[PDB]
């Protein structure tokens, strides 16, 4: 946990922290002499008061002031160094999640929305900054100011004060650490529900168009008001208990340090305690409020932030990629396919796939028809690397798919959906998304073969913008955007699913053969009921509610079974 | 601006602020007596020192301590009252944007993503809280502590100190207010680029699936690193200048208050100034650092937060809805249609619509065919209430569409798209989105007519969840979800666009006639090239690249023009 925080510090990052560590711990020394200086200032007024006993008052006045100026200017140096550190430990932090999300599975990206992660990352940098505000300052600065006090009073031989001052620190730690336990899980849940409070704003602001079109303003507001009060009442539970802990600790200061002020004020009127000794003991308590309270700031803030930070390490940083079965993917390409007894359970309630023992061999065109999405559209999604809640193993040239990590898996297995994923930027962006190694020459080359170079009988520029959810291009052009990424990249096993729903023959002839042209040694798989696409194939499969039922050519399936016979009569 | 901040305070909200105002302004009084108490403590040590001149030292010691305890415990009461206020001024703030977004146009929702608003609202509650931290505390608390100082020193007749103490406050305001001007627009831009820094994370985390599938990890990281440094360097420009302003103001304290400490320390060694008078003047400067610095906190924090808060009022709170042309919508329904010379300019570069003078009359079925999306799909979107960058007026029973506000406009004009807008919750949620007045009885009633009640020959429960971007249901079922909202609501002018792209005759016969059944007096408009849907119509229109070209029946258009003749030959 600690290493991940210190990892954010680069060259300048590690240089400003040690600067922060010294400067703050230096101010503690100069401020510890401060009560002792005024004691000898006060004592001096009852002295002989000759030539040098009026110049000493002047001297020590500056000596006390300098100590204040030094510790004063030290905090401004502390909040300038940290403000410089705030920038440096944000740059190398923003990507330390971006890249963590990339390598993590879709099963943890489908259940997380845009606004969720906007706050999930917001609380991480919020807690680490607070953890630095405690690791640097509150670790040494109070400790140095507190130890001086214990011995100084023990040295001047005021044993009671030397006891009670130690007893407050003795009690204060036990009281806080025991209570922090729940306060931590309460700030945890408070931030966890605060997380969920904006997990709904994400779904709100995105689909507000429909809400405006259906006018359920109240539902939008009321559903949001429900989570809002779920947060407030969970924040009440924490604030209440946190505030109640204060009145306890602050009462103790009046209990212990109040009685010490009483103790010495009694002994001073007699003659057991001098004016200065009394003045020093009261001024010590006066300057004992600063370390005592900042010791508390350490104990709590560190623990509650560490628990709310722990809910960021045990989910994204492994055990998804341990750098294990990175092998292999053949370099001459061609990897075939072999599935043996595939079974899925989404919500456990039913069996998606029952028994699937199939073997496919690369370099030829295959097809998947029958009862629509009964387990044919999903079968290839588990293969492509969406879910790992399946049974058996999917072998691809001596290697099962459950073994290969998602970084090497997507290099050979490229899958085309109906639901295309387009960004909110230039044409170049989405095209260079398939490859950063492909520059302007091959980019415009893939465009003429992706049937989107010349749109409305006029060539499209590469700086042409695109609006969110594919709001810039039509139903047919949204699918052809998903097609440009295919020719720009180079896979070994290609899968196609009902992406020929928003396309016609004048453009379906120039696309279905170009895949065979560019990728001939590859394993092309298509999932579209069209008879003209089911005929070009070397092998056709029928998938009824999960289990495999038929296989072979189109001319044998339209004679043997009656679905392919009742699909070939609708031409 | 100020009224919108005070509006957040309800009954308990307005009660805790006045509690905050008194308690903080009360601590300023007790702390102003503090330097004067120690002055008479110090002076007393050079006195006659009889019976009552050792009991007075004891008395004033408590009197000084109580003053510290009072001001000390006052800050904990201040940060407990504000922590209570933080909850109360968040509940009535979260919706004070949710509802502001609802009434605002799509043209300001298409250009704003989920993560943008997650931070656009985050900085609003961040600046108001800071503004309360200045309006309550820093308005009175320093002012009371500062005025006492001016007269006390003027009363004790130390005219120089009474001058220089006033001169620092005289200079400090002019220095800060002149420099704040740019610092405000720099924190503005800093927060504006910080806004834009996460405007890309929204597009990143949402479409990470494609990035993982196309492996452009570097591009994702590098594009994010580009905005990250665009932020850091814009944050550098602010921090640098802000930090440079400190070393100036803090030098002035050593320039002015340093020389006053020198002034009196010179006059004390002589006999012009007594021990106590000197001790009080030094202790005043000592306790003058607290109001002076907190006066600065007011001057700046208020101005920079007010400018970064101003960029939240002049965009959402009007001039979209002034409560003007709320009239009318006929109660017996039937409102007809009348467009006169419609023209659009998206990027100005071209003319989307050239000349459109058309009149439609309610109670009958209409159609729009021809060259796909050439201005036929967009024509109805400007009508439905998407854009106001058009020419002319669209009259609907003596009222032009440019006049009716979007709240009354969506009640009669309901439009069905291909791109459906589904949420991330239960079946009930999306269904009750069309109406909150419709309970369980009519909800299940619309389901059997929306062809989604009995899915896979098994009835679907109303607590059935749905995954983001329609990831739970298929291409055909995503369109039929958009259809249930139609029968659940009651419009006067219905528009349909290529939503019959992912549907077949066994379900297209049970839907196309049910709209005529449920809404007969309504103006049904369809935009689908299908000949069977173009025949049922009372009037068909042809739309070529913006301008109107043909109108009339299907049997006259398939004889007169050659497109409808070359569309009716493909059956």
From Swiss-Prot, chains A, B:
<dbReference type="InterPro" id="IPR027417">
    <property type="entry name" value="P-loop_NTPase"/>
</dbReference>
<keyword id="KW-0079">Bacteriocin immunity</keyword>
<dbReference type="GO" id="GO:0015031">
    <property type="term" value="P:protein transport"/>
</dbReference>
<dbReference type="GO" id="GO:0043213">
    <property type="term" value="P:bacteriocin transport"/>
</dbReference>
<feature type="transmembrane region" description="Helical">
    <location>
        <begin position="278"/>
        <end position="298"/>
    </location>
</feature>
<protein>
    <recommendedName>
        <fullName>Microcin-J25 export ATP-binding/permease protein McjD</fullName>
    </recommendedName>
</protein>
<dbReference type="GO" id="GO:0005886">
    <property type="term" value="C:plasma membrane"/>
</dbReference>
<feature type="domain" description="ABC transmembrane type-1">
    <location>
        <begin position="17"/>
        <end position="304"/>
    </location>
</feature>
<dbReference type="InterPro" id="IPR003593">
    <property type="entry name" value="AAA+_ATPase"/>
</dbReference>
<keyword id="KW-0813">Transport</keyword>
<keyword id="KW-0547">Nucleotide-binding</keyword>
<dbReference type="Pfam" id="PF00664">
    <property type="entry name" value="ABC_membrane"/>
</dbReference>
<dbReference type="GO" id="GO:0015421">
    <property type="term" value="F:ABC-type oligopeptide transporter activity"/>
</dbReference>
<keyword id="KW-0812">Transmembrane</keyword>
<keyword id="KW-0653">Protein transport</keyword>
<dbReference type="InterPro" id="IPR036640">
    <property type="entry name" value="ABC1_TM_sf"/>
</dbReference>
<comment type="similarity">
    <text>Belongs to the ABC transporter superfamily.</text>
</comment>
<comment type="subunit">
    <text>Homodimer.</text>
</comment>
<feature type="transmembrane region" description="Helical">
    <location>
        <begin position="17"/>
        <end position="37"/>
    </location>
</feature>
<keyword id="KW-0997">Cell inner membrane</keyword>
<keyword id="KW-1133">Transmembrane helix</keyword>
<keyword id="KW-0067">ATP-binding</keyword>
<feature type="transmembrane region" description="Helical">
    <location>
        <begin position="58"/>
        <end position="78"/>
    </location>
</feature>
<dbReference type="InterPro" id="IPR011527">
    <property type="entry name" value="ABC1_TM_dom"/>
</dbReference>
<dbReference type="GO" id="GO:0005524">
    <property type="term" value="F:ATP binding"/>
</dbReference>
<feature type="transmembrane region" description="Helical">
    <location>
        <begin position="159"/>
        <end position="179"/>
    </location>
</feature>
<feature type="binding site">
    <location>
        <begin position="370"/>
        <end position="377"/>
    </location>
    <ligand>
        <name>ATP</name>
    </ligand>
</feature>
<dbReference type="InterPro" id="IPR039421">
    <property type="entry name" value="Type_1_exporter"/>
</dbReference>
<dbReference type="InterPro" id="IPR017871">
    <property type="entry name" value="ABC_transporter-like_CS"/>
</dbReference>
<feature type="transmembrane region" description="Helical">
    <location>
        <begin position="135"/>
        <end position="155"/>
    </location>
</feature>
<dbReference type="InterPro" id="IPR003439">
    <property type="entry name" value="ABC_transporter-like_ATP-bd"/>
</dbReference>
<keyword id="KW-0472">Membrane</keyword>
<comment type="function">
    <text>Is able to protect a cell, which harbors the plasmid pTUC100 encoding microcin J25, against microcin J25. Is required for microcin J25 export out of the producing cells.</text>
</comment>
<keyword id="KW-0080">Bacteriocin transport</keyword>
<keyword id="KW-0614">Plasmid</keyword>
<dbReference type="GO" id="GO:0016887">
    <property type="term" value="F:ATP hydrolysis activity"/>
</dbReference>
<dbReference type="GO" id="GO:0030153">
    <property type="term" value="P:bacteriocin immunity"/>
</dbReference>
<feature type="domain" description="ABC transporter">
    <location>
        <begin position="337"/>
        <end position="570"/>
    </location>
</feature>
<keyword id="KW-1003">Cell membrane</keyword>
<dbReference type="Pfam" id="PF00005">
    <property type="entry name" value="ABC_tran"/>
</dbReference>
<feature type="transmembrane region" description="Helical">
    <location>
        <begin position="253"/>
        <end position="273"/>
    </location>
</feature>
